[PDB]
Amino acid sequence: QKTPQIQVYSRHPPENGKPNILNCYVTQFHPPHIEIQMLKNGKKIPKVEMSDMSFSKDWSFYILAHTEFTPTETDTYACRVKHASMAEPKTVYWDR
Amino acid sequence: NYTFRCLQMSSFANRSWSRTDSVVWLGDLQTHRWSNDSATISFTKPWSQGKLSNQQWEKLQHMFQVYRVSFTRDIQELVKMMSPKEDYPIEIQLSAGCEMYPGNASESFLHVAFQGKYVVRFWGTSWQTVPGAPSWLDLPIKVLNADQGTSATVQMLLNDTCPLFVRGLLEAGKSDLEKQEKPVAWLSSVPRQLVCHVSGFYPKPVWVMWMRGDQEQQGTHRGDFLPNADETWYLQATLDVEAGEEAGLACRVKHSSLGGQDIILYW
Amino acid sequence: TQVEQSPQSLVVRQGENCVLQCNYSVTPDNHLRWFKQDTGKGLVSLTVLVDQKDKTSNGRYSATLDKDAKHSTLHITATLLDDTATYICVVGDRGSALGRLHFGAGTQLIVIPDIQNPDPAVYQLRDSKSSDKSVCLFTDFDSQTNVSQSKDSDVYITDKCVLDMRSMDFKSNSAVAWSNKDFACANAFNNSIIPEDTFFPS
Amino acid sequence: AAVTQSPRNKVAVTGGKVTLSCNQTNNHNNMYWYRQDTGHGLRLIHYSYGAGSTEKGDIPDGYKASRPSQENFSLILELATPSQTSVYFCASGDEGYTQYFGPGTRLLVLEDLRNVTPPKVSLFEPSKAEISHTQKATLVCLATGFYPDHVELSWWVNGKEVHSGVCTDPQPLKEQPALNDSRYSLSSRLRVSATFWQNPRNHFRCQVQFYGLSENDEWTQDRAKPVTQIVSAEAWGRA
Ligand SMILES: CCCCCC/C=C\CCCCCCCCCC(=O)O[C@H](COC(=O)CCCCCCCCCCCCCCC)CO[C@H]1O[C@H](CO)[C@@H](O)[C@H](O)[C@H]1O
Ligand SMILES: *[C@@H]1O[C@H](CO[C@@H]2O[C@@H](C)[C@@H](O)[C@@H](O)[C@@H]2O)[C@@H](O[C@@H]2O[C@H](CO)[C@@H](O)[C@H](O)[C@H]2NC(C)=O)[C@H](O)[C@H]1NC(C)=O
Ligand SMILES: *[C@@H]1O[C@H](CO)[C@@H](O[C@@H]2O[C@H](CO)[C@@H](O)[C@H](O)[C@H]2NC(C)=O)[C@H](O)[C@H]1NC(C)=O
Ligand SMILES: *[C@@H]1O[C@H](CO)[C@@H](O)[C@H](O)[C@H]1NC(C)=O
């Protein structure tokens, strides 16, 4: 088993009250079975898009989740990954 | 120089449940996908059929269609054959394609991994184990190499079909493969570490450095190339700095898209 | 069923050629093999075809295989009595032991032997241990003759059968009739169409 | 590269335990059990990739498989039913696609053994008149009064089996077709040259291998236990 590494980042420079896309890059895990959630203030965003799963030369899996978001002074966004390798699900928060 | 990769991933949870999904890459651009749920292979680019005629592609999709069903049963049976040496869950990954070099030259590969470790390859006219593989694999290799029909076909795919297909792909896909997208940059600090965010550039080669004028700041740590959804790239560089020292610090970015006029930002 | 054979059964005369079809939907189709099976016995392999469009022979047997059409035929040339058997089609779905074989239900062939010298008779034969019991043997009739059951159900009569004395290149038909008696051979086949030249010794 | 099955032929009752065996000395890893019924092609019951391994085939119900060694592969019927009346084939192979088949095993499973009966055998000697007319001599063998119909008739001259000049009824006949468990008769002919039959040093024998009860089957009737056995009839040549 291998642990997932999670990276949250935005497509365009973030501007308050200005439409954007939020990316969640999940890499380095094995086996391929994974459960990825994108959260707003702790609640699941719906209509989240996933790239197809693929793997790198080192045989480790990766996938890209992304969704449309508007950043505001007051909203917190996160990426929540569940995998066999972990006892508990791991949450990475978006920070500028 | 481009590498064409057909990456296959198959999971087997037990004796009955399995799924196989595939993706296809030319360099760092996805060309096909074939999910377990789909009876047929999907193009992800308009030029994904390359310079193949419709009859040729149909003939080719068909081959794979049959292989997917064959592959599933074979693995299940190879498990039956070795048991209780191995057992489910089982994870098999293939990596197949060719690297294209100038003019005529090319080199094909087919690499198999079992439980995330590279164990088998097709080489020459047969399957063989690679250094480190467990000896029990000798029975499956002996079984797989008994199949003369599979051998001739795989040989044909690697020596002939792959390079031919990819030469056509590079023609058809020239526009996309050679596209130039400009990076956009922004700056931020964390409790002090400065972050230069560079996003939206294509292709992958980029230069990003923190600078005080002409002086190139060591301690600039670039992370990894992270992908955007629109098939551009994202990269960031962190510089470690003392609190109350951000004055005069710039981030300079060079990229083929910008054509000479670098991006310079200031805090 | 994924392998079909035609015809289900056929009757030919000695010397005549025949063709046997095999059609299948098996996928993939690595090879196709034709078996011969004598009644009451095992599976002798005649040929195995392997190529996209393949052709094979084996003495009087020849065969084709067209993989696009998923079709194969087996030609027997100049049939002999011994060709009488069930012929079976098998498609194998891999080129390794990972394969499953898919069997046709077979095609049954009967070859009528050419009787060159018909000399039909009905003879009386005695029990080696018992001068009491006897049988009536109807022999040396050609193949345009039929043997039928008797009126009396106390009279047993068996269907014709052909023997081959390989050593002499000689074949003959016969049938046996006996009964628990007043019963005699001259009256034994009364309920059959027997030739007017049939020999009845004194 | 050959394969052996035993028994070749078996009469069994409902609720019995029947064991069919397969042996191969080819050092083949893989073995396979099939059954053949008229109107179907061979259908795979169970198979094995080596000692201690057994796998379900297409129609495994009512059968257990057993692979105790590289050499042996067994098909076990714990509770035999009439529907398992069939001809069973074993095969073996290495990594290649070829399967080398055994000679086959016929099994019949009856509801009751009450009627099982060995045949009576009689040899009928050549007609002097036939001899005179054809210069050929036909012996006739008769096997009568047996149940069920699982018999193998063979001819032997001077203790060696003969096939040339032999014809045997494809199927036995029923001695009383009206009746439920009718007994059977079966005939065979052996034709030879007059001078061969006229040789008083030639021993002719008709032999019927009957398949009946085992020494392990319970028998409760007064008459003799109708076990698997050979009954034969015999005569010498004469001038
Ligand atoms: C261009 C779009 C790309 C499409 C998506 C990419 C998908 C796949 C990429 C791979 C390309 C390979 C294709 C091969 C085609 C062959 C045709 C065929 O269909 O081949 C399959 C046999 O399956 C395989 O080939 C299995 C692949 C072998 C993988 C080796 C794995 C090593 C095992 C190690 C671990 C074992 C663990 C288990 C024990 C615990 C069946 O072959 C049958 O059918 C063929 C067509 O008639 C005949 O040539 C052949 O005679 C017959 O056997
Ligand atoms: C296909 O080419 C191979 C050699 O090419 C290499 O192996 C391929 C699978 C792939 O990895 C290529 O990119 C490699 O460069 C031929 O294999 C040789 O065959 C000859 C005679 O058949 C034999 O004597 C050699 O041992 C083989 N060479 C090696 C290096 O193993 C093969 O014949 C080619 N097949 C066809 C159908 O063209
Ligand atoms: C992955 O793909 C295969 C084929 O599309 C699926 O296998 C089929 O599953 C259904 C049951 O839902 C069966 O009726 C068929 O017999 C199967 N087809 C075969 C074996 O060729 C498989 O279920 C899919 N996997 C998942 C996880 O959805
Ligand atoms: C096989 O795996 C699936 C998914 O992992 C699981 O839900 C299912 O219960 C398993 N099948 C059996 C028969 O246990």
Author numbering:
A (entry chain B): 2 to 97
B (entry chain A): 7 to 197, 204 to 279
C (entry chain C): 1 to 61, 63 to 100, 103 to 184, 186 to 206
D (entry chain D): 2 to 240
What did the paper state?
Invariant NKT cells (iNKT) are an evolutionarily conserved population of T lymphocytes able to respond to lipid antigens when presented by CD1d, a non-classical MHC class I–like molecule. Antigen recognition by iNKT cells is mediated by a semi-invariant αβ T cell receptor (TCR) formed by a conserved Vα14-Jα18 rearrangement (Vα24-Vα18 in humans), and a limited panel of pairing β chains (Vβ8.2, Vβ7, Vβ2 in mouse; Vβ11 in humans). Indeed, recent studies identified the structures of DAG compounds from the highly pathogenic Streptococcus pneumoniae (S. pneumoniae) and Group B streptococcus (GBS), which were able to stimulate iNKT cells. The most potent S. pneumoniae antigen, Glc-DAG-s2, is characterized by having a sn-3 linked glucose, a sn-1 linked palmitic acid (C16∶0), and most importantly, the presence of cis-vaccenic acid (C18∶1, n-7) in position sn-2 of the glycerol moiety.
In order to investigate the molecular basis for this different kinetic behavior and the role of the unique structural features of this ligand in determining its antigenicity, we determined the crystal structure of the mCD1d-Glc-DAG-s2-iNKT TCR complex at 2.7 Å resolution. The structure shows the conserved “parallel" docking mode of the iNKT TCR on the CD1d-ligand complex. As a consequence of this unique binding mode, the TCR α chain mediates the majority of the contacts with the CD1d-Glc-DAG-s2 complex, with additional contacts with CD1d provided by the CDR2β, CDR3β, and, to a lesser extent, the CDR1β loops. Well-defined, unbiased density was present for the ligand, superior to what has been observed for the mCD1d-Glc-DAG-s2 complex in absence of the TCR, suggesting that the ligand adopts a more rigid and ordered conformation upon TCR binding. In particular, the TCR recognizes the 2′-OH and 3′-OH positions of the hexose ring via H bonds with Gly96 and Asn30 on the α chain, highlighting the importance of these two hydroxyl groups on the antigen in the formation of the complex. However, due to the presence of a glucose on Glc-DAG-s2, the 4′ hydroxyl group is no longer able to interact with Asn30 on the α chain, in contrast to other galactose-containing glycolipids. Consistent with what was observed for the mCD1d-Glc-DAG-s2 structure in the absence of the TCR, the sn-2 vaccenic acid is bound in the A′ pocket while the sn-1 palmitic acid occupies the F′ pocket. However, while in the absence of the TCR the vaccenic acid encircles the A′ pole in a clockwise manner, the opposite orientation is preferred in the ternary complex, although residual density also suggests some equilibrium between the two orientations. Moreover, upon TCR ligation, the glucose moiety is shifted by about 30 degrees clockwise around its glycosidic bond to assume a position at the center of the binding groove as observed for other TCR-bound glycolipid antigens.
